[PDB]
Structure 1
Amino acid sequence: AYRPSETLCGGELVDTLQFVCGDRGFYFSRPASRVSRRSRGIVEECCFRSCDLALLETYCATPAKSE
């Protein structure tokens, strides 16, 4: 189900990852990536850019302290 495309900001966009990351939790602060420099991080993108969704999908954290 979910929604179409939207934009949500700091705290509010936590809900995006909250729905796509899921049972593991997301990290927000992605480390480096494969572009030899840094990469995007939360809020500047759903708050300042757009919520590309796939983003939030990848913001999730499987190797997280399970509960």
Structure 2
Amino acid sequence: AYRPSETLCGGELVDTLQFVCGDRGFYFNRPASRVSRRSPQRGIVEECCFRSCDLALLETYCATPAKSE
């Protein structure tokens, strides 16, 4: 269903990632590299700020596996 806050950006997006994943860790742009920050690879921002997303879509960026069992 529609949410008035179906988009997030900046710290809002980080806070929601901290909520679904815990402070245990999450990816933002899944870079898996540390060579520089001259490479703005696409990620969660494009799905949640430049587009709308749900907590469930957002949870796919967690740096830990699902443990609902």
TM-score range, shorter chain: 0.5 to 0.7
Question: What TM-score results when the alignment is normalised by the length of structure 1?
Answer: 0.60
Q: In the TM superposition, what is the alpha-carbon distance from 1:37 to its structure 2 partner? A: 21
Q: Which runs of 5+ in 1 are unaligned?
A: none
CA displacement 1:15-63 (0-9 Å, x = unmatched):
1111101142101123699999999611111111112221221111028
Q: CA RMSD in A?
A: 6.5
State the secondary structure of the residue aligned to 1:61. coil
**Structure-2 separation of matches of 1:53 and 1:66:** 15
Q: Which runs of 5+ in 2 are unaligned?
A: none
When the two structures are aligned, how many residues end up with a matched partner?
A: 67
Report percent identity of matched pairs: 99
- After TM superposition, where is structure 1 displaced by more than 4 Å over at least 4 residues in a row? 1-5, 31-40, 63-67
